[PDB]
């Protein structure tokens, strides 16, 4: 989560 969030945002 922590890193697939990072780049979607």
């Known amino acids: ?3 697939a969030l990072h ?3």
């Open 1 to 3: 989560l922590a890193e």
């Open 7 to 9: 780049s979607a945002l």
